[PDB]
Amino acid sequence: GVFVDDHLLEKVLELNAKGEKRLIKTWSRRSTIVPEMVGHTIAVYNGKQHVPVYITENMVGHKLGEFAPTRTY
């Protein structure tokens, strides 16, 4: 159903421990955001591209539709 790139978390927990607000790339398949991304631009792997989305404490929970919920087309 939905999976969160653990490979991105392994790098975001490091940014949450030092306090660095950088970006974390991902290349799995159903890459989704998490709570640890509330201050990072993680390039979630949409299946073909890495979209570095700076997640806040409200866009996480899906994958990127919460960061780009601007209707369709």
Number of domains the chain contains = 1
34 Cβ neighbours under 8 A, 6+ residues apart: 4, 9, 12, 60
Q: Which residues span the domain enclosing 71?
A: 1-73
* Experimental technique for the deposited model: NMR
- Residue showing tokens 């990072």: 40
Question: Are 40 and 54 spatial neighbours (Cβ–Cβ below 8 Å)?
Answer: yes
- Sheet with 50-55, strands from edge to edge, namely 23-25, 40-45, 50-55
Q: Which of 48, 47, 58, 52 is nearest to 11 (CA)?
A: 52
12: CATH: 3.30.860.10
5 Cβ neighbours under 8 A, 6+ residues apart: 26, 27, 28, 31, 32, 42, 44, 45
Q: How far apart, in whole angstroms, are the C-alpha atoms of residue 71 and residue 38?
A: 23
End-to-end CA distance of the chain: 24
β-pair partners for 45: 50
